[PDB]
Design a protein around this ligand. Structure first.
Ligand SMILES: Cc1c2[nH]c(c1CCC(=O)O)Cc1[nH]c(c(CCC(=O)O)c1C)Cc1[nH]c(c(CCC(=O)O)c1C)Cc1[nH]c(c(CCC(=O)O)c1C)C2
Ligand SMILES: Cc1c2[nH]c(c1CCC(=O)O)Cc1[nH]c(c(CCC(=O)O)c1C)Cc1[nH]c(c(CCC(=O)O)c1C)Cc1[nH]c(c(CCC(=O)O)c1C)C2
Lengths: 356, 356
C-alpha cells in the first residue's frame, strides 16, 4: 500500500504528542451529503455495501469536502448478523429490520459457524483494499464492527428499541443462551476484524452503541467480557500473522458507568458520548488511554460561530494530550455540510492555539 | 424447526378459505435473476445442487425480492436418475444430457437398487434442513421430484425431445421393461420424497413435465398408476414414522386430457399449464381439489399494467376458493425480475379485492 502521509490520527491514538488535534466524524459518509444520497439512490443499502467501488466513493466524498484526519470505510454493523445467516432489510424510512428475530434458544441453530463468517464478508475486505489504494496515503483508514452485545440486541429485538426489553429478558431469563450467542458473535467478529486489517485497515473501532440500556452489573457480566476478548484476540492473531496491530477504539454510547472498566479493556482509545463531561471522563479512564469525542452532534445546528465556541470549550476541557476530536455520536441526515466543515476547521484552529 | 409464520399457501393447498390468494412461481430461483447467475458462476449445476449453502442461498434470493408465499428448494429433477447410477451433464448452452441413455432392457442392470437412492441424495436433505432453518418460518418450503414417466423420458431419450419417440417406442415395444423401469423410479422416489419431508419440507410437488406426449390411453397405462403409487406410499410412510403428511401437488404439463384422473390420484393440488381454461379445469377436477397455476409464463413479457389485467382475469376465472396462483410453467431466463414482481403484487392485490 501507499505510504501514509498524514498520520496524526494514529499518533494521537497511541498517545503521542501531536502538533494539532486530529478530527473525524462518525457518519461522515452519510445522508447529510447530497452526493451520498445521489450515489446511494442506485441501490438498496446492503447492496451498496457489497460494491467495493460504491463503498470507496462514499468513503472518499467527505474528504473531498473537509480536511478530516481519518477516513472510515463505508459499511454497516449489521453485515455480521447477515453473514451469520439472518435476513436483514433496510425499511422504507423505518431503518434496519430482521423480520425473523432470534427469540428462543433453538433459534441459535440457524446461525453459521462463526469461523466461516469472514469468508462471507470478503466484499468488505475488497472495499477496504480498494479504498486504501485509492486514498493513496492521504489519511488513515478506519475499519469497524458492532460489539457483541449491541449486535445481539439487533438480532433479538429485530431492529431498534427504546428499552431493549426482549434482549434484556434474554440476559435475565436465558443467561446461558445469551452467553452462547455473545460467544458466537465474538468468534465471528475476531476473524472479521483481523481480515479488515489484512485488507488494509489502519485502525479499528468497535461500536457498543446499545451499552446504555445495561446498568453496570449487566454490562460487566454480558458486554465487557466479550469487548475484552475481541481486543485480546484481534491483537494476538495480527501479531501471529506477522502484521502490526492497529490502534483499537471502543465506543460505548451511554456508557458513562463503564468508563473505568473500558479503560482497562485493551483498547488504545475510549470514545465518549456528549453526556459525559470531558474532565470527568479523564478522571475515570486515567492518564494512558486516549479519549475520542465528544461534541453533541446537534451542536452542528448552531451557527458556524457558535460551533467554533463550543469546540473551543470542548478542547479546553479535554486538553491537548491523548485526544482525538469527534462528535458524541454520528451526524444526522438533516445537518448542513458547511457546519460539519466549521467543526473540522475549529478543531484544527483551536488545538493549534492551545499548544502555542 | 422455527414455527411457520405465513401459512397461507398450506391453508390454500388443503382447501381452506384464506384472506388472499397465495402465489409462488416455478423457477423463481432461476437465471432471470442476475444474483442467481452470479452464485451459479462458481460451479457446474450438479455441483451447485450438492452444496447445501449454495442451494439455500439460491432458494432465498427470490424471497428477498418479492413477497412470494412459498419457497421451493433449489435442486434438479435429474438428481434421481443420477442417484440411480446414470451419468448426467449440464451441456454448455444445450441443457441436460445422459451420454449413455438406457436403450435396451439389459441396460436396467446398471441401475442401483431403488432402496439405496435416498442415501445417495443426502445432500438434498441437507439443503432442505438448512434452508428450513434459515427461512426461520417466513413461508413454507416446497420439496419436489420428477414423476416416473418424465424421469424415464430423460433416461431413455438422453435429454429433451420434441416427440419422445424412443421413450414411447419403449412403451409400445417393451411394455414389461417399461413397467420395470417405472417401478424402479417409483421405489426410488417414495423414500426420497419422504426423506425430503423428514428433512423439513412442508409440501411436495411432483413434476410430470412430459405428460403431454402421451395420449390418455398411454398415460393411464404407464404414467397414472405410478403417480398414484407415489402419493399413496409417501403418505403411508410419513404417518407410520409419526410425522404429519404434507400437501402434495401433481403438475402434468400438457396434461389437459388427464385432469379428471389426476383429481382422484391422491394429491391435494393439481397444477395446470396455461393452455387449460381455468373454468374448464374446475369442471374436470371437481370441487375438492385445489388448483394451481396457470398464467402463460410469456405473459410476463407484457407491460406491468398488462400483467395486472391478465392476472385479474385469471383470478376471476379461478374464483377465490381452492386456488394457489402460479405460472403455467417455469420462468424463462430472459424475463425481467420487475415483471415477476408485478405478477406477485397483482395476485395479492386482486385476490383481496375479489373477497371484499
Ligand atoms: C460506521 C457506519 C455505521 N453506519 C454506516 C457507517 C458507514 C461509515 C461512515 O460512517 O461514515 C452507514 C449507514 N448505515 C445506515 C445508514 C442509513 C441508511 C441509508 O443510507 O438510507 C448509513 C448511512 C443504516 C443504519 N444502520 C444502523 C442504523 C441505526 C439503527 C438504530 O437507530 O438503531 C441505521 C439507520 C445500525 C448502525 N450502523 C452503525 C452504527 C453505529 C452508530 C454509532 O453508534 O455511532 C449503528 C448502530 C455505524
Ligand atoms: C424445481 C426446479 C427445476 N429445475 C430447477 C429447479 C429449482 C427450484 C427453483 O425452481 O426455483 C433448477 C434448474 N435446473 C436447470 C436449470 C438451468 C441450468 C442453469 O442454471 O444453467 C435450473 C435453474 C437445468 C435443467 N433441468 C431440467 C431442464 C429442462 C430440460 C428440458 O427442457 O427438457 C433444465 C434446463 C429438467 C427439469 N428441472 C425441473 C423441471 C420441471 C420443470 C417444470 O415442469 O416446471 C425439469 C423438466 C424443475
Amino acid at each position: 500500500f501507499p505510504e501514509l502521509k498524514n498520520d496524526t490520527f494514529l499518533r494521537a491514538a497511541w498517545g503521542e504528542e501531536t502538533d494539532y488535534t486530529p478530527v473525524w466524524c462518525m457518519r461522515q459518509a452519510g445522508r447529510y451529503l447530497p452526493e451520498f444520497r445521489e450515489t446511494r439512490a442506485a441501490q438498496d443499502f446492503f447492496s451498496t455495501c457489497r460494491s467495493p467501488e460504491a463503498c470507496c466513493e462514499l468513503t472518499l466524498q467527505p474528504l473531498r469536502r473537509f480536511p478530516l484526519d481519518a477516513a472510515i470505510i463505508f459499511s454497516g454493523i449489521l453485515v455480521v448478523p447477515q453473514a451469520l445467516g439472518m435476513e436483514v432489510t433496510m425499511v422504507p424510512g423505518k431503518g434496519p429490520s430482521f423480520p425473523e428475530p432470534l427469540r428462543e434458544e433453538q433459534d441459535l441453530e440457524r446461525l453459521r459457524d462463526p469461523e466461516v463468517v469472514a469468508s462471507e464478508l470478503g466484499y468488505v475486505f475488497q472495499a477496504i483494499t480498494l479504498t486504501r489504494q485509492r486514498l493513496a496515503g492521504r489519511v488513515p483508514l478506519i475499519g469497524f464492527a458492532g460489539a457483541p452485545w449491541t449486535l445481539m440486541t439487533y438480532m433479538v429485538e429485530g431492529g431498534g428499541s427504546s428499552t431493549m426489553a426482549q434482549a434484556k429478558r434474554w440476559l435475565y431469563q436465558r443467561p446461558q443462551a445469551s452467553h452462547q450467542l455473545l460467544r458466537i458473535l465474538t468468534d465471528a467478529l475476531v476473524p472479521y476484524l483481523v481480515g479488515q486489517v489484512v485488507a488494509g485497515a489502519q485502525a479499528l473501532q468497535l461500536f457498543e452503541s446499545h451499552a446504555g440500556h445495561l446498568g453496570p452489573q449487566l454490562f460487566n457480566k454480558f458486554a465487557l467480557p466479550y469487548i475484552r476478548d475481541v481486543a485480546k484476540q484481534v491483537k494476538a492473531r495480527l501479531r501471529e500473522a506477522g502484521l502490526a496491530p492497529v490502534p483499537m477504539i471502543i465506543f460505548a454510547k451511554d456508557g458513562h458507568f463503564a468508563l473505568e472498566e473500558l479503560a482497562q479493556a485493551g483498547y488504545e482509545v475510549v470514545g465518549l458520548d456528549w453526556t459525559v463531561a470531558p474532565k470527568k471522563a479523564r478522571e475515570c479512564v486515567g492518564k494512558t488511554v486516549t479519549l475520542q469525542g465528544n461534541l453533541d452532534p446537534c451542536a452542528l445546528y448552531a451557527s458556524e460561530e457558535e460551533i467554533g465556541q463550543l469546540v473551543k470549550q470542548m478542547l479546553d476541557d479535554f486538553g491537548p494530550h491523548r485526544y482525538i476530536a469527534n462528535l458524541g455520536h454520528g451526524l444526522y441526515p438533516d445537518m448542513d455540510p458547511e457546519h460539519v466543515g466549521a467543526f473540522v476547521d475549529a478543531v484544527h484552529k483551536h488545538s493549534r492555539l492551545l499548544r502555542q
